[PDB]
Amino acid sequence: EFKYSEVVEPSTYYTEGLCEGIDVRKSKFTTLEDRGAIRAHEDWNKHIGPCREYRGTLGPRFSFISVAVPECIPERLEVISYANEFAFLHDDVTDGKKRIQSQLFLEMLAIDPECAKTTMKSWARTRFVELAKYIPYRIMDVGEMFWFGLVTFGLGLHIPDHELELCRELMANAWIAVGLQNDIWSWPKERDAATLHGKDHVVNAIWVLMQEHQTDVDGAMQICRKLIVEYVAKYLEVIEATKNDESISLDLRKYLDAMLYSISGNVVWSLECPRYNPDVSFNKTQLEWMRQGL
Ligand SMILES: NCCCCCC(O)(P(=O)(O)O)P(=O)(O)O
Ligand SMILES: [Cl-]
Ligand SMILES: [Mn+2]
Ligand SMILES: [Mn+2]
Numbered sequence: 001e002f003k004y005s006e007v008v009e010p011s012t013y014y015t016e017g018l019c020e021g022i023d024v025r026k027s028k029f030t031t032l033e034d035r036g037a038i039r040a041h042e043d044w045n046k047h048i049g050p051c052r053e054y055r056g057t058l059g060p061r062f063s064f065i066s067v068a069v070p071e072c073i074p075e076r077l078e079v080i081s082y083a084n085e086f087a088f089l090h091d092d093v094t095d096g097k098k099r100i101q102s103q104l105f106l107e108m109l110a111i112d113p114e115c116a117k118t119t120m121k122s123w124a125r126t127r128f129v130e131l132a133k134y135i136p137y138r139i140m141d142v143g144e145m146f147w148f149g150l151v152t153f154g155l156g157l158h159i160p161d162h163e164l165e166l167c168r169e170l171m172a173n174a175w176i177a178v179g180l181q182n183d184i185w186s187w188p189k190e191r192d193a194a195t196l197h198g199k200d201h202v203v204n205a206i207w208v209l210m211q212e213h214q215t216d217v218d219g220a221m222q223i224c225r226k227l228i229v230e231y232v233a234k235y236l237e238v239i240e241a242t243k244n245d246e247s248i249s250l251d252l253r254k255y256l257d258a259m260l261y262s263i264s265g266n267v268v269w270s271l272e273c274p275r276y277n278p279d280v281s282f283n284k285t286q287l288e289w290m291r292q293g294l
């Protein structure tokens with residue numbers, strides 16, 4: 001079932017109980033993520049704006065995709081990472097000579113034509129105060145469709161265009177969980193941010209909660225955390241049920257199972273990622289490429 005990654009040993013990383021039930025697997029080719037990402041840095045630096053030693057998908061120990069998609073087909077690892085960083089870019093901008101990223105697009109056809117077209121096609125595209133309302137919004141402000149299109153490719157999945165409607169209704173709890181996670185850890189980031197624009201609000205669950213619940217910062221977190229834990233289960237439920245219906249795509253069922261590790265992945269990464277954790281430094285290896293190599 002798994003041939004491109006190893007389980008990470010639990011006594012070596014912190015989970016904060018925020019993914020009870022999921023192994024942690026590392027892609028066993030993580031340095032491909034390194035190189036795919038950094039090229040994107042260079043390309044960005046090259047073609048649209050300054051970009052050196054950027055805090056995105058890379059972590060000194062846990063880099064995102066290496067740990068969020070650890071069974072990704074090795075040959076495809078770089079370009080995916082290349083994508084994700086660009087994604088991680090195009091976000092910072094949200095919170096020219098850039099159409100030239102078809103070289104990326106082109107890169108994919110050379111590998112998997114159909115998977116590419118989907119994914120590409122798949123890539124067709126505030127101030128909330130009650131959680132019930134936010135959840136719809138953020139579940140895409142985090143990038144459901146992107147990630148979808150992303151993983152399918154790297155796993156070379158083909159799902160028939162009809163389950164498309166279905167699939168998303170399965171991974172609600174999932175996408176829900178990770179949204180909150182980001183909002184927990186991207187919180188100070190995204191918090192200091194709203195402080196600058198002069199915003200009265202922060203488009204972040206923590207802020208919503210504080211409003212919806214008359215509570216302070218601390219109060220918002222505990223709840224959110226209490227919640228994440230519960231959407232975890234809610235999704236885990238699904239697995240067991242869905243484990244054996246053949247009207248379900250082999251691929252979908254794969255894709256579902258694969259989502260587990262994005263969750264576990266998100267945790268450890270976000271607990272480390274220089275992106276959310278400035279104090280965090282990279283690898284010798286990681287840097288040696290950023291400063292000099294690649
Ligand atoms: N698929 C996992 C990517 C998590 C990124 C979350 C964010 O990009 P970040 O909090 O990193 O800016 P968003 O701004 O959309 O909350
Ligand atoms: Cl822990
Ligand atoms: Mn533990
Ligand atoms: Mn952001």
Ligand SMILES: [Mn+2]
Binds near residue numbers: 091092094095141
């Ligand atoms: Mn964003």
Ligand SMILES: [Mn+2]
Binds near residue numbers: 182183186187190
């Ligand atoms: Mn965020």
